[PDB]
Amino acid sequence: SEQSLNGRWTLKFFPQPAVPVMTIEGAEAANGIVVDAVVPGNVEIDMEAAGLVEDPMVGNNIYKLRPYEGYQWYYSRTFAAPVVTEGQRLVLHFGGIDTFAEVYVNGIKVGSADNMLIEHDYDITSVVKEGENRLDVIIRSSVMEAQNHFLGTLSIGNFSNEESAPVRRAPSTYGWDIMPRLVSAGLWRDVTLRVENPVTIVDANWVTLSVNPKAREASESLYLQTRLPFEMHDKVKAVITISRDGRQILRKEALMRKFANLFTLNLSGVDAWWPRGYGEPALYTAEVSLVDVTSGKIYDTKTSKIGFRTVKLELDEVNLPGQPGQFQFIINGEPVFAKGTNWVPLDALHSRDASHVEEAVQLMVEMNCNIVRCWGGNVYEDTHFFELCDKYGIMVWQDFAMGCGNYSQRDNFAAALEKEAISVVVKLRNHPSLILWSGNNEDDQSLVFGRLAPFKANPNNDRVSRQVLSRVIYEFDPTRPYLPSSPYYGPKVCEVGVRDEVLPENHLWGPRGYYKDPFYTENPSQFVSEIGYHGCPNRETLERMFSPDSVNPWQNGVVGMWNDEWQTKANRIYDDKFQGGRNDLMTNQVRIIFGEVPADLDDFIFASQSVQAEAMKFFVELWRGRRPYRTGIIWWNIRDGWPLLSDAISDYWGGKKQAFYYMQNVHHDVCCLINPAANGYMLKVDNNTLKDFEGVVEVKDVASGKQVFKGKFVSKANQMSEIATLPMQKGQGMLVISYRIEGNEYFNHYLYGEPPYKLDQYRKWVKKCGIY
Amino acid sequence: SEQSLNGRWTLKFFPQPAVPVMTIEGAEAANGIVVDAVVPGNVEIDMEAAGLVEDPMVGNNIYKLRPYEGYQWYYSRTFAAPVVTEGQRLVLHFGGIDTFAEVYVNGIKVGSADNMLIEHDYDITSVVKEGENRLDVIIRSSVMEAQNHFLGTLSIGNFSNEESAPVRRAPSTYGWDIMPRLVSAGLWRDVTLRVENPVTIVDANWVTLSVNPKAREASESLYLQTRLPFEMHDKVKAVITISRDGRQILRKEALMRKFANLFTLNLSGVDAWWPRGYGEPALYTAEVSLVDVTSGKIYDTKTSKIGFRTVKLELDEVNLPGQPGQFQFIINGEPVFAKGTNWVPLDALHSRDASHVEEAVQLMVEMNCNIVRCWGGNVYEDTHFFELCDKYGIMVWQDFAMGCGNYSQRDNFAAALEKEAISVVVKLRNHPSLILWSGNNEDDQSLVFGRLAPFKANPNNDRVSRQVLSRVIYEFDPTRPYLPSSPYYGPKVCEVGVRDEVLPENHLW
Secondary structure, three states, X not given: OEEEOOEEEEEEEEEOXXXXXXXXXXXXXXXXXEEEEEXXXXXXXXXXXXXXXXXXXXXXXXXXXXXXXXXXXXXXXXXXXXXXXXXXXXXXXXXOOEOOEEEEEOOEEEEXXXXXXXXXXXXXXXXXXXXXXXXXXXXXXXXXXXXXOOOOHHHOOOOOOHHHOOOOOOHHHHOOOOOOOOOOOEOOOOEEEEEEOXXXXXXXXXXXXXXXXXXXXXXXXXXXXXXXXXXXXXXXXXXXXXXXXXXXXXXXXXXXXOOEEEEEEEEEOOOOEOOOOOOOEOOEEEEEEEEEOOOOOEEEEEEEEEOXXXXXXXXXXXXXXXXXXXXXXXXXXXXXXXXEEEEOOOOOOHHHHHHHHHHHHHHHHHHOOOEEEEOOOOOOOOHHHHHHHHHHXXXXXXXXXXXXXXXXXXXXXXXXXXXXXXXXXXXXXXXXXXXXEXXXXXXXXXXXXXXXXXXOOOHHHOHHHHHHHHHHHHHXXXXXOEEOOOOOOOHHHHHHOXXXXXXXEEOOOOOOOOOOXXXXXXXXXXXXXXXXXXXXXOHXXXXXXXXXXXXXXXXXXXXXXXXXXXHHHHHOOOOOOOOOOOOHHHHHHHHHHHOOOOOOHHHHHHHHHHHHHHHHXXXXXXXXXXXXXXXXXXXXXXXXXXXXXXXXXXXXXXXXXXXXXXXXXXXXXXXEEEEEOOOOEEEEEEEOOOOOEEEXXXXXXXXXXXXXXXXXXXXXXXXXXXXXXXXXXXXXXXXXXXXXXXXXXXXXXXXXXXXXXXXXXXXXXXXXXXXX | OEEEOOEEEEEEEEEOOOOOXXXXXXXXXXOOEEEEEEEOOOHHHHHHHOOOOOOOOOOOHHHHHHHHHHEEEEXXXXXXXXXXXOOOEEEEEEXXXXXXXXXXXXXXXXXXXXXXXXXXXXXOOOOOOOOEEEEEEEEOOHHHHHHHOOOOHHHOOOOOOHHHOOOEOOHHHHOOOOOOOOOOOEEOOOEEEEEEOOOEEEEEEEEEEEEEOOOOEEEEEEEEEEEOOHHHOOOEEEEEEEEEOOEXXXXXXXXXXXXXXXXXXXXXOOOOEOOOOXXXXXXXXXXXXXXXXXXXXXXXXXXXXXXXXXXXXXXXXXXXXXXXXXXXXXXXXXXXXXXXXXXXXXXXXXXXXXXXXXXXXXXXXXXXXXXEEEOOOOOOOOHHHHXXXXXXXXXXXXXXXXXXXXXXXXXXXXXXXXXXXXHHHHHHOOOOOEEEEEOOEOHHHHHHOOOOHHHOOOHHHOHHHHHHXXXXXXXXXOOOOEEOOOOOOOHHHHHHOOOHHHOOOOOOO
């Protein structure tokens, strides 16, 4: 049925001439180097395996891949065609081509590719031959393709590279603060051969109309579209089976009289799908088969795991004085508080993304996040990531691949984007974890705040984010809410002016200074979808990613002066030399908190990690603590996609920073947290479950050992409760909160006082706490 | 670098058959009269110089040009191709073709023209040959081209001629109260040959973000787009120089790492640009060059005179009793009173417009006008007109070349109009005198007041004025206000009814 073309290919690369090569004769006549290639894979990996490129993850070797951005790649292989009977179709499927390519089978052009993100399918039934057949893909330079378009004023000067605007690729591949500039090329996803019967299932869409969690009942609809010859009309029946493990719940057989039908299923004894903490992620195996009525032949079969859930978004785009707006997620008729992480690319070389999926999903399970926001600068994740999210009950907020920039309003861009959006929506609409579609990341912020700020442009007139994607979602997925842009500058916002006070949801970056500044504590946004603080990686990562002489951050021993490699790893997209920049954020924060920047490397690492951990823990507690007004916090990020110095709490090679352990003790389902008050500190308990729990909480000072508070608490379901108010303690110190719920003991801590602190005293307090 | 094809051409004209001639063999086989022609020029001027047409400016001689509106015009010339090295491009540029034509170089078609108001550029690098080369342009009748379209009820009965609606020409050429009916045809603007290096500047947009007149400071942005071979990446630097007279004010050098960049310039000792009476029209010479880092070769250079000014329009759509509206121009943060004249075509034979520009602009200097409104029935003026307005501090209010009628809502017209609008906006966006873009002239007035008045049509549903044109300005020129129609019948006006009392701005005839 399916034959995989993955394995060993032949790769020939040559510099791209003035007129790009688009034929097999031109590719064969060009002068280039021939090396063995592995599919799926990137050309950089294949070049490294041939001893032509040094490891780009060490030092300044990333800048030595610049000359290869103007090369042309020619992949070739010989395959044996499967035996195809009369009426069957042979389909060549490429999971991903990067980016512009012309596919040729037996010397005949079967199609062309111009989108990196979506899948490509070609019908090669007529062109195949008996015996060996030859497949050849000629890839052009993506950087030089951007010069074929005229760019408007909106598309120049944004954070996203100008080369990214006219083409459809991942914006982060061109360079970002969090990711290196690795344009790359190649067949980064699987290539397979498929044989389809004349009767086949083009699409099956499972839609949950209603779910009654208490009665264990749900109503499901199946929209099935098939390819059906007329001679097979009324002679084919559709068998629909829903089962849990091996036990069967519902079986329905219906004769197929039309190519497209809608089947209504009323189920009983079915449990609803819940995110983490609010319930169990119940998944049921839904299978639809096309079976002949006379004989028993099965023409086609499609199987997937589905969950019964309803998602609604309460949106009021303006917080006016006295008129609070709203941004809250309603799952199964119950409001939920979202605590989770932004998901940035798992690797600069995207062909290695599939191997890192399980480890990163396990990281999010360990942190106990109930939501992930797929960043707009990343490619669309494959099916395995969404299957894991379904299994572990983590809701997914998906961004279309546009971010930090404005795009063309002309027809050619819209046609390409509509095709890509239709493909993605049909691909990813059956996963219960996916709850929201978002138009872009920070595109409205770029226009309102940026180089065109004084001209007061209106983001609501954007065609791309408000006419194309909205229409696609309206036609192909009406069951999910759609958000035009991540910082939503709606029509009502523009009437009263754009500012942080009128945004129910906003990204809080701004001045990355004392975490306890009024910019963060007094921000009125009910939902924050991007917030983070810089932190220095562990010593092992530093030694692995930096030359032996460059391990020490200081240049010539001068504190505060970064050497060339350290400056590169902050992320300089282009090889130019300057002092300061993004790296200065780490030293400024350390100086504000601990007074002085330590000269020793280990002490500097400890100080930076402690500052990041304290800032991140303080931010999550402030939002969870101030509920019911606050409705969610999606922080930045849980893992880095390249060895770099960044805001991630875990690095590329799995090393966990101190922020990971601190933030783990503030993501618990029932958490006792201390928040600042006008006089003293106030102890509170937050519940993100649907149940009631009771327990004993004790608070004592780490240094003196005096017990500040001790009592019993009762936590109501899905609410933040007030326990007691603690008297203000004198000077600087740590209070250790220890709570036992249902025979399990959990611990947390609070740092009281005012900066600057003493690093030795802070280390002593942390060691005496013993929780880290 | 540039070679001019202007001069003496050969013109053959013949009546257009039932099937219009579109090939060189058909044009040469037709029976016609051969006369010498001068480019730039109109066919009527060339015919007059041959003693075939009486002077149309005297008496009723204008009506004797009617039979020539159904003729076909074939212009021909032989040119010597410049020497072109490897990687260089040879570009054929026509400043204006009137109107529908098929251009053929050495017997090979290189393109087609269907817009009189915009420039046409063709790449003829491959088709040229050593020695003499032949250029031939075959022009078809503009009047008979209007019969290939089906007209809606909106496009019939308006003051503008029905033949003007489907095609893209100057509406006044078909007849107006102020202008004679003289359709004419020909190459009315310059024809030139350009040689471009592989590294060249496609566009340089100077934008003034802020200006502080008192501190003599301003912030300027340069959006540069270039053609850059990959082998030349990081080996080309952009040299930006801003100077007044010979004195240099700012010089910035930046390495070119991508084809499109945005450069931010913070200037001091720079004076703001003011209209007449409110100050001095200070102009500074802004030049950008692409220079190789290793050697000193200069691949390309663009030079222009720019002024530092900010323009805002305070607009309130409706004048209500007790709630007055607003229609005011704010220049450099100050409200200004605009007194000036509408600019109507300088000549019916548009190839003579360039000679009248200097004399006509001096009229507005003597009158001391501080604003000119370019009428919608006229062609778009050339660069020289706007340079004079910059020098003398006269603000320009430009109308898109549609007026006194309603146009098609279908896709074919929208695509043609969008192509024209982009070309015009990119051409004229760097002139400090240009302060406002207007959608049309009296198009809302024609629909509301006219043959379809009793049916109470809503002008706010017009596709051309409020969707196609506003989107082009939104993308290619966000620094200038846009007015959907010259008499603006906004959504608020239609709610309370369309009357002279509720219009903050109106035409009073």
